[PDB]
Design a protein around this motif. Structure first.
Motif, mmCIF file in Angstrom:
data_model
loop_
_atom_site.group_PDB
_atom_site.id
_atom_site.type_symbol
_atom_site.label_atom_id
_atom_site.label_comp_id
_atom_site.label_asym_id
_atom_site.label_seq_id
_atom_site.Cartn_x
_atom_site.Cartn_y
_atom_site.Cartn_z
ATOM 1 N N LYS A 1 3.338 0.150 -7.546
ATOM 2 C CA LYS A 1 2.246 -0.676 -7.071
ATOM 3 C C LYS A 1 1.722 -0.338 -5.682
ATOM 4 O O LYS A 1 2.480 0.008 -4.789
ATOM 5 N N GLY A 2 0.410 -0.454 -5.518
ATOM 6 C CA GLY A 2 -0.211 -0.212 -4.230
ATOM 7 C C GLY A 2 -0.210 1.194 -3.677
ATOM 8 O O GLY A 2 -0.348 1.375 -2.473
ATOM 9 N N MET A 3 -0.033 2.195 -4.531
ATOM 10 C CA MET A 3 -0.066 3.566 -4.056
ATOM 11 C C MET A 3 -1.465 3.718 -3.490
ATOM 12 O O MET A 3 -2.419 3.168 -4.028
ATOM 13 N N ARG A 4 -1.596 4.447 -2.397
ATOM 14 C CA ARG A 4 -2.901 4.614 -1.788
ATOM 15 C C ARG A 4 -3.101 6.056 -1.409
ATOM 16 O O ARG A 4 -2.200 6.704 -0.876
ATOM 17 N N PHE A 5 -4.282 6.567 -1.701
ATOM 18 C CA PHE A 5 -4.565 7.951 -1.399
ATOM 19 C C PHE A 5 -5.931 8.100 -0.748
ATOM 20 O O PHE A 5 -6.835 7.297 -0.974
ATOM 21 N N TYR A 6 -6.065 9.120 0.087
ATOM 22 C CA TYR A 6 -7.332 9.378 0.725
ATOM 23 C C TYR A 6 -7.935 10.539 -0.034
ATOM 24 O O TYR A 6 -7.445 11.667 0.059
ATOM 25 N N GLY A 7 -8.978 10.243 -0.804
ATOM 26 C CA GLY A 7 -9.646 11.254 -1.595
ATOM 27 C C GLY A 7 -11.130 11.193 -1.337
ATOM 28 O O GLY A 7 -11.616 10.244 -0.725
ATOM 29 N N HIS B 1 2.687 6.654 0.342
ATOM 30 C CA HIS B 1 2.242 5.321 0.709
ATOM 31 C C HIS B 1 1.966 4.530 -0.552
ATOM 32 O O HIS B 1 1.029 4.814 -1.284
ATOM 33 N N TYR B 2 2.823 3.547 -0.800
ATOM 34 C CA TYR B 2 2.737 2.673 -1.968
ATOM 35 C C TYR B 2 3.355 1.373 -1.521
ATOM 36 O O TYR B 2 4.107 1.345 -0.552
ATOM 37 N N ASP B 3 3.057 0.295 -2.227
ATOM 38 C CA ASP B 3 3.613 -1.000 -1.861
ATOM 39 C C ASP B 3 5.046 -1.169 -2.370
ATOM 40 O O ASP B 3 5.840 -1.891 -1.768
ATOM 41 N N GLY B 4 5.368 -0.495 -3.473
ATOM 42 C CA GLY B 4 6.703 -0.581 -4.049
ATOM 43 C C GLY B 4 6.780 0.006 -5.449
ATOM 44 O O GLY B 4 5.766 0.174 -6.131
ATOM 45 N N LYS C 1 11.759 -1.747 -5.439
ATOM 46 C CA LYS C 1 12.294 -0.947 -4.353
ATOM 47 C C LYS C 1 11.045 -0.641 -3.527
ATOM 48 O O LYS C 1 10.289 0.287 -3.838
ATOM 49 N N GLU C 2 10.807 -1.441 -2.498
ATOM 50 C CA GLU C 2 9.625 -1.239 -1.679
ATOM 51 C C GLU C 2 9.713 -0.010 -0.780
ATOM 52 O O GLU C 2 8.706 0.419 -0.221
ATOM 53 N N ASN C 3 10.906 0.566 -0.659
ATOM 54 C CA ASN C 3 11.107 1.735 0.186
ATOM 55 C C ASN C 3 12.053 2.787 -0.397
ATOM 56 O O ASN C 3 13.070 3.129 0.198
ATOM 57 N N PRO C 4 11.717 3.329 -1.570
ATOM 58 C CA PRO C 4 12.582 4.343 -2.178
ATOM 59 C C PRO C 4 12.413 5.665 -1.435
ATOM 60 O O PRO C 4 11.579 5.785 -0.537
ATOM 61 N N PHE D 1 16.420 -4.655 -1.770
ATOM 62 C CA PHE D 1 15.929 -4.756 -3.141
ATOM 63 C C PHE D 1 15.339 -6.151 -3.290
ATOM 64 O O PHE D 1 15.987 -7.137 -2.930
ATOM 65 N N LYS D 2 14.116 -6.229 -3.809
ATOM 66 C CA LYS D 2 13.444 -7.512 -4.031
ATOM 67 C C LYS D 2 13.587 -7.862 -5.517
ATOM 68 O O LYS D 2 13.324 -7.017 -6.377
ATOM 69 N N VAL D 3 14.008 -9.096 -5.813
ATOM 70 C CA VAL D 3 14.204 -9.529 -7.203
ATOM 71 C C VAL D 3 13.492 -10.831 -7.595
ATOM 72 O O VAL D 3 13.520 -11.823 -6.869
ATOM 73 N N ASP D 4 12.850 -10.788 -8.760
ATOM 74 C CA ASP D 4 12.120 -11.913 -9.333
ATOM 75 C C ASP D 4 12.795 -12.261 -10.641
ATOM 76 O O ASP D 4 12.976 -11.395 -11.485
#
Ligand SMILES: Cn1c(=O)c2nc(N)[nH]c2n(C)c1=O
Ligand SMILES: Cn1c(=O)c2nc(N)[nH]c2n(C)c1=O
Ligand SMILES: Cn1c(=O)c2nc(N)[nH]c2n(C)c1=O
Ligand SMILES: Cn1c(=O)c2nc(N)[nH]c2n(C)c1=O
Ligand SMILES: Cn1c(=O)c2nc(N)[nH]c2n(C)c1=O
Ligand SMILES: Cn1c(=O)c2nc(N)[nH]c2n(C)c1=O
Ligand SMILES: Cn1c(=O)c2nc(N)[nH]c2n(C)c1=O
Ligand SMILES: Cn1c(=O)c2nc(N)[nH]c2n(C)c1=O
Lengths: 121, 121, 121, 121, 121, 121, 121, 121
Positions: E8-14, H108-111, H100-103, H29-32
């Protein structure tokens, strides 16, 4: 029919809780209410009488969340759903979500809670 | 078919509202629009003519949200849905969500509003 | 001395405003209060009597924000600052910030408002 | 004197920019304005005439941000500061912050920009 | 089967875009990828070989988002979906969402975009 | 002189760190850069040559954050500050803030880091 | 000297509080720690021994926030400041901020708390 | 039946991961967790015994997330789902989401993460 009316993030300070200390101190309860209602007539006429007034809805939610202290979230959500359906025929179904973002739970979480969907009879 | 085109969080300052004071002062209305459209041809060709242009979509939404003052949110959402479907054949269905994050409601909530889904005829 | 006590993001629904329609409908006011107080004794003793109780502070802020309707934010902030300093000797200085995130201003902004710093005499 | 009046997060869609493509397409500019003004009289009287009206302030900011396209942010902030000070004697000093959250900069950042503080002469 | 794997939320500059100025300057594209995959074996074995590796998935997404400039979002999402399904048998279906939070659209909205769901053949 | 130029929330994926495992895996580093520069001439002329170009600034920051792996944040911030001051005479002073929102620290915090202010000689 | 080292948003679940019910149930405490330290040598050498290790700092904060239950925030902040200064000579000054985002205060606010600045002797 | 019980955003610091360096350093680790449960009796009686206690649920999640280090997220989610269903008959179905918000993913991604739905047998 997928039309809805909504009131999101309503928050109330109530003293509900199963733990005596909970009812003593109190906390903030966040509430989300989604009502199933056909809004094409009102969308056609533009007449507030052809739809469900939320301010009124909010008053029902409030009077329950800020009323006598109870034990469970399931009781508050059931009193709200039952109360909304009894007063409005246009509401085909009512969904109530109550979140306790700060329960007496030693840990790090965004919030805990319940949700119920009650069709109107 | 589960493809969609979206415009999220559009916000407009309009003077709609059932209360005279609402139409006098005005407020910000947040709008979410999701359109059902098949995007495989456009995804195959890469030709903007094989799909629905959002900037145009946004212009329709805007012209309605920032136009004459009406009473209900249901009227604005119905004018937008009806307007989008009439102009675009590729839109199989249109969903309109309008939020009033600051209505004349004495309380603490994140926002109130309505949502409608209008299939294209 | 750079110690402080704070109450951030307090929000109240009041009917203050220079426009008649403002006092009619009402809105949410966000308030930030920072008090200059020496907290080493209290930090040394751990005795709440050697410091300024915020819950009390919040009660003063509330009673003013949710009281009679006035015209300016400057009047509310001055009534709060003056009220806090008169009741607490330990507060060497009081800073009041009031934000109107939704004034009758046709536009897109996060909020408008004022801030004042009142030293205790 | 540490009193201030503020307008935070104002956002405008303008076509300013040194790159021709910037002026062609346009973008959103976020603006923060903090004015140095003594608010004790107004806080004492409760008379809007004893202070600086923000809605007016916002109108000045707007007319500049949504006016002719210029090259630098420094030019917009200088036109706003100079414009606010010339029209209001009570403003002892004006601070203007303009953020370009999406400049033509290939990267990941929250925003770029400038800030200036202009005392009133 | 309702199991999924997500990025989720991957962001790229294209530099994708139908407007010449868009391809010149460029912007940030936000991408959400949800893959339908059965994760009980991997959940049973704990063997990364019994599931779909996301870092690899991210590499495919990246190489496409940060590759040659194209016209539509529908083309990027179709190249990503088609590319993911061709390389992984375990992915029963792929959903791609691309958001342009700052298109050349004169207005205030949170973002615009498209979404597609492509079942694996 | 209180004018500044800023680049907030820049984020880079680098492999800096004192722990061998840190340099192996890598992480995201968030960087804030505030430069002291007089912007009245540029604000007067509207000529980008009378001020400091941020895109260039960002290029310096980037080339350092995404360059060889080092041990401390203090080394990265000192290489950036020293590098910015050496290349621009107009920068009277440079402030560098680097945040590690996810260091190898077993706990719950928003982020850790350092900040330095380096006047231009 | 304006260099600093920081640990922002640390959060701990402790049972501190003046109200018996507070110590019974417990809550989350948010802590911000800013230390005054000269980081040019470390920025010059790149040697972690020429600076203050935060992970260690975090361990001190933690052991205090998650230790025996006390009455005031002022006591926790004073134990942390005093503890950090006693163990590190390089820390010229220590600032501690503790926020109780959910105290037993019937209302809507973002959080309450205290802050102290303790120079190292 | 569309009633649910939820625990959102739980976060734990564990050392799970396929990369040796991951298990060495660790991460958050974030869990729902969403459980299918009929809440009308409990909503009718107000008796916590007629429903599923979350604090208990959280204890199960925790003991697994903060227990021995494993390789995949699919293994943690499967141990949690299986563990919750085995202990509670009222839970008709359990959904587990781990982010995993920081693998160790250079980007650049949110998770990133997985989700599974396990019906109770
Ligand atoms: C106050 N309260 C509740 O309402 C509740 N509802 C469930 N399912 N579990 C609960 N606990 C533990 C509690 O304390
Ligand atoms: C302006 N306005 C509305 O559009 C509306 N729509 C519903 N359903 N209720 C409404 N009220 C109270 C209102 O004031
Ligand atoms: C209600 N209200 C205020 O308090 C105020 N304070 C300033 N400075 N300007 C103001 N306006 C326009 C207003 O409507
Ligand atoms: C539009 N624009 C600016 O205003 C600006 N101001 C500085 N200092 N640098 C700038 N660049 C590169 C730019 O493109
Ligand atoms: C770059 N770009 C697109 O990809 C796109 N896709 C749709 N449906 N409309 C679009 N416009 C206007 C555009 O500029
Ligand atoms: C990578 N790294 C640093 O840069 C650092 N800087 C300080 N002051 N402490 C640090 N630690 C523990 C670390 O691991
Ligand atoms: C636990 N606790 C505190 O630490 C505190 N510190 C101040 N200044 N006031 C306080 N109150 C009311 C409290 O309950
Ligand atoms: C730790 N870890 C995982 O759990 C995982 N699960 C999938 N599907 N891919 C994964 N990778 C790459 C990883 O490192």
């Amino acid at each position: 029919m997928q039309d809805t009316i909504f009131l999101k993030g309503m928050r109330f300070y109530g003293y509900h809780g199963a733990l005596s200390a909970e009812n003593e101190i109190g906390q903030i309860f966040k509430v989300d209410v989604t009502l199933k209602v056909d809004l094409s007539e009102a969308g056609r006429t533009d007449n507030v009488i052809d739809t469900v007034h939320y301010g009124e809805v909010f008053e029902e939610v409030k009077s329950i969340m800020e009323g006598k202290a109870v034990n469970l979230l399931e009781h508050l959500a059931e009193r709200i759903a039952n109360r909304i359906n009894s007063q409005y025929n246009r509401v085909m179904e009512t969904k109530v979500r109550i979140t306790k973002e700060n329960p007496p739970i030693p840990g790090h979480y965004d919030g805990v809670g319940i949700e119920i969907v009650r069709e109107n009879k």
